Paper text:
One peptidoglycan (PG) hydrolase, AtlA, has a predominant role in E. faecalis septum cleavage. atlA mutants are viable but form extremely long chains and are greatly attenuated in the zebrafish virulence model of infection.
The structure of the catalytic domain of AtlA (AtlAc) (161 residues) was solved at a resolution of 1.45 Å. The structure also contains five glycerol molecules coming from the cryogenic buffer. Only one polypeptide of AtlAc is found in the asymmetric unit, suggesting that the protein is monomeric in solution. The AtlAc active site shows two highly conserved glutamate residues: E212 is equivalent to L. monocytogenes Auto E122 and FlgJSt E184 catalytic residues and is located at a similar position, at the end of helix α1. The second predicted catalytic glutamate, E246, stands on β2 and is equivalent to E156 in L. monocytogenes Auto and E223 in FlgJSt. Unlike Auto and FlgJSt, which show an open groove for the active site, the AtlAc active site shapes into a tunnel.
Residue numbers in the entry: 4 to 165
Amino acid sequence: ALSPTQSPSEFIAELARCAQPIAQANDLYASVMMAQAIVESGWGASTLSKAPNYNLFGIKGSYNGQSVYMDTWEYLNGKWLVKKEPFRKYPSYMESFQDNAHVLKTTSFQAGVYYYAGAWKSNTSSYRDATAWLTGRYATDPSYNAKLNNVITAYNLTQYDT
């Protein structure tokens, strides 16, 4: 299953079935989507990513009012700190994929400016531009793009892009 899974190969094949169509429909890289699920969830092992939360993507805030508070590492002003933060809670694994796409496509702090626009496939030359854009935006980890890129390259995840 996504959890527990027999191998990275299993986990990847199961992610692709959801990620490929959603990424294609939304001008996103499937590879980046799948890397974010692997890195955020720890191959589907995190409590946040498992039932009854199903949040594969470390998405913060609330989903139709549904949230779970969890301890999380943040990198702030040059220090790693544990913070307790609100994460979205979903009814199944599918909504977390849809919501990752929604967050990337629609997040805006200023009129006419989409915060994640640099991770949209049409605004990039390669997936590396998208992972770089997420760093310091989606997550505070200053090595976030290196962690995503390392998963993409190790597992040839651009095979799922189109």
